[PDB]
From a paper:
[name] (IDH) catalyzes the oxidative decarboxylation of isocitrate to produce α-ketoglutarate and CO2 while reducing the cofactor nicotinamide adenine dinucleotide (phosphate) (NAD(P)+) to NAD(P)H using divalent metal cation (Mg2+ or Mn2+) in the tricarboxylic acid cycle. Although the amino acid sequence identity between subfamilies I and II is low (<20%), both IDHs function as homodimers; each monomer is composed of three domains: large, small, and clasp domains, and the active site is situated between the large and small domains. The thermoacidophilic archaeon [name] strain 7, which grows optimally at 75°C and pH 3, has an open reading frame ST2166 in the genome encoding hypothetical IDH. In this study, we expressed, purified, and determined the crystal structures of ST2166 in the apo and NADP+-bound forms at 2.0 Å and 2.4 Å resolutions, respectively, and discussed the mechanisms for cofactor recognition of prokaryotic NADP-IDHs.
ST2166 crystallized in a monoclinic crystal belonging to P21 that diffracted X-rays up to 2.0 Å resolution. Residues 101–108, part of the Cd loop and d helix (residues 97–118) equivalent to the phosphorylation loop in EcIDH, are disordered. Each subunit containing 17 α-helices and 15 β-strands is subdivided into the large domain (residues 1–120 and 302–409), the small domain (residues 121–153 and 196–301), and the clasp domain (residues 154–195). In the structure of the apo form, putative isocitrate-binding residues (Ser109, Asn111, Arg115, Arg125, Arg149, Asp298, Tyr156, Lys223′, Asn225′, and Arg274′, the prime designates a residue from the adjacent subunit) involved in the binding of isocitrate in prokaryotic NADP-IDHs are exposed to the inner surface in the deep cleft of the active site. Therefore, it is probable that ST2166 has the same catalytic mechanism as proposed for other prokaryotic NADP-IDHs. The apo crystal of ST2166 was easily cracked upon soaking with citrate but not NADP+, suggesting that citrate mimicking the substrate isocitrate can bind to the opening active site of the enzyme and induce a large conformational change to break the crystal lattice.
Numbering used by the authors:
A (entry chain B), B (entry chain A): 1 to 100, 109 to 409
Write the structure that this text describes.
Amino acid sequence: MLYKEPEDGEKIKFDKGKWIVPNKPVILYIEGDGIGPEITNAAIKVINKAVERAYGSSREIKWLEVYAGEKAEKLVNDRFPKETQEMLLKYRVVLKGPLESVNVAIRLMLDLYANIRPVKYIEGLESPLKHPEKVDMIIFRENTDDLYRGIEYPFNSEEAKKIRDFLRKELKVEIEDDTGIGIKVMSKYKTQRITRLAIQYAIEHKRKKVTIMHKGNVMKYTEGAFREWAYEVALKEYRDFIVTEEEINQGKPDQGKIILNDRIADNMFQQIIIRPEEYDIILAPNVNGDYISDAAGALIGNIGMLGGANIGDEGGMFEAIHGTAPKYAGKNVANPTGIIKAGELMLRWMGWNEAADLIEKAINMAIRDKKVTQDIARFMGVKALGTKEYADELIKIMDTI
Amino acid sequence: MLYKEPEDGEKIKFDKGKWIVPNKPVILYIEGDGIGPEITNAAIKVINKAVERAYGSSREIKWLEVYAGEKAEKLVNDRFPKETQEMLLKYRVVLKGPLESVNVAIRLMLDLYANIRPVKYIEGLESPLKHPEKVDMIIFRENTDDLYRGIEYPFNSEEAKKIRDFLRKELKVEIEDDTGIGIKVMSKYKTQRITRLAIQYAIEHKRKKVTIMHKGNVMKYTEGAFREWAYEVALKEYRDFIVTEEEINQGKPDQGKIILNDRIADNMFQQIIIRPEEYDIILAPNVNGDYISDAAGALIGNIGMLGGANIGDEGGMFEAIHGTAPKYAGKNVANPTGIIKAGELMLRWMGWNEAADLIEKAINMAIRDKKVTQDIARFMGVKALGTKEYADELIKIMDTI
């Protein structure tokens, strides 16, 4: 067999979207290509330290490396070996480094319909913004619906012609012939799924607000429906947990309750820059979430220091928001912060917030203390630490907090 | 006649979508609701001074007021009277204050398919950005195509059912029944005309770069087609005026030529925040143009101080990017900078660049000297100037440069 499973660990379980994590959970990891090996092993070491510091020996992640990408191609001549897939379907939780699609395959096989993008100010880090201090949001992007379904046809195709003829005769819709055509689809079920995940996360992590991003004023039956369905499932399934903005400024009490409001897409691309502190959890459809994530991440410096995840009803894949950077591979120079942040997010989803908070804290202290990798040092005029050395600094710091 | 037309003026002409402006052009204006009267009259006074200072008495705008909105309702009991429509179809160029729609009606009747959004840094204003200095761009948004055509249907409508049945049997596309449906259309012709306008503007006003905004990597036949069609008309109709980014990093020289490149939408939402100086003219389809405009304008912070326009092959409507501000109506408090900026844009389209430059410099100087209205004075600890007084200050300044 290609893998030796830890006989000391147990798979993480799920009952209805909720992660039931054993004290010795088996968690998979994929090194990744290029800088993958260096940053991922660094992440694992940092994570193990946070878990031991926070919980002592009462908890311990039983890591199981699986192969994918170049490493897999060189070892067994298959970039996504059958055994790797089997371990994924079995343990369903993986921390994976950058890969040169394997990412799409993992998301599809584990049905990780939600893309999670936390973006929080990191003290010490330069920002294009004069006041990034209060940036603390998390984007919940539905990642299987919308125009990204790929239902589209070229302007000069027979398919497009059939659509145009159909729209004209059956719907009396006027459309010229020199037109490319895409079908935007918005599912009630898909909208409810992501909405539930967002509210449940708010409850579990003491988040105070969820904002629905939409262009419902013009895209009435797709994004406007998204908004409607989101409020609908929130009020029907999380009644005594949430309070709508239409209730606050109406009389209802929001004391100890999560505020559920909504904003027009165009306004959000504006406010994220002018006053990003207004947002906590952002709930949005596929396309909007894609664009708002890019803007939000730019609010802080170096997007390569952010982590993210794709979550499903029974599984999750956590990764850094950056590429393989083949130029620095094996040079012990890459910044492991991003993949470490993916680990922090993973810790939070597992309910191990104490270990996650220790990592967040150690990073803030390391960066404020100018103990950073080259990508940052080059700007704060100081000697850079290597990948391994930087990870070790985070470790010694956690040992004192 | 309801309107006494200036017997001394001449109408602006159009040749291949190029403005042929007489020395005494008739230009229509609509005061607008709320603060409209105060700011539009101030703009007219500043525009006339700029024209007088730059060309003496050799040129003079023959303004002609037409009614729309609440003033029209009171005077002729019609929000958009027939007489107003007649003047618009005749003179085709109008400076319009904010209105509480008339905006859509003017755009349709004059086929003003291009939404123009200039946004450049103004010396002295608060900015969310640490470095807004080199922000100097103009967004050219196709404003009649894309999802905004409104071809959409509710998930439980018989129309939506007809569409899903069609796609299933004729296209063999699988789609659930609980889905709202929108149709994204992208026209080759609509894309070409907006592209021609953008390049022609770059040529006319010595602009050096045009960047196409798109998500063609995932929306290949709509936005990807937009990109392809834009490059096509550019290379085919403006060959000796432009050079592509691909050609430059291929060996070709860009000396004396406008640069034409493209960027994926998500990348632009990032770069517009971290380094907006990279953009000059942004060419984009309806939806992207909408979102990018919001993000771009947020870079300077004072949205109410921006001007904009809708241009067609034979006309133009210029307006400020703000509402009627009823709370400030008739209190001589409103900031007229946005509508003046719209007037500055109108002068550039007219080819009267000297007058436009005067307005631009005067505003810069006024702000740098802290001679501003309350919306700005509030943050610089100086006494605010009224609407009339601020306009008069710009006028005394223009008499000096």
